[PDB]
């Protein structure tokens, strides 16, 4: 309730970690120049891109 | 009745001992930072705290 646990700081830490992760993802997308670097980014579209690259 | 026994002082001693004990309990709770240091403090709540700690 008072000392042993400070829940506001925990919530703030969570949100801070999430924001840092999102910024890191954006940095990856900007440095790479591609919007899809992993399949977790977009599954339907990775396959399409690979087939289109083969066709090109 | 007059000399051999002084009952007011006995009652005062009892109350003094009780107050000292309560103050000591409060000191324990303040130094520890926890409201439940023994099961005599609270039985239903010790178990809940332990299960919640395990889950955390």
UniProtKB/TrEMBL annotation, chains A, B:
It comes from the Bacteria. This is Uncharacterized protein. It comes from Kurthia sp. 11kri321. The lineage of its organism: Bacteria, Bacillati, Bacillota, Bacilli, Bacillales.
């Amino acid at each position: 309730m008072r000392i042993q646990h400070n829940i506001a700081a925990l919530n703030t830490h969570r949100n801070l970690a999430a924001n840092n992760a999102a910024a890191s993802k954006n940095l990856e997308k900007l440095s790479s120049g591609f919007k899809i670097n992993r399949a977790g980014d977009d599954a339907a579209g990775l396959a399409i891109s690979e087939k289109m690259r083969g066709q090109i």
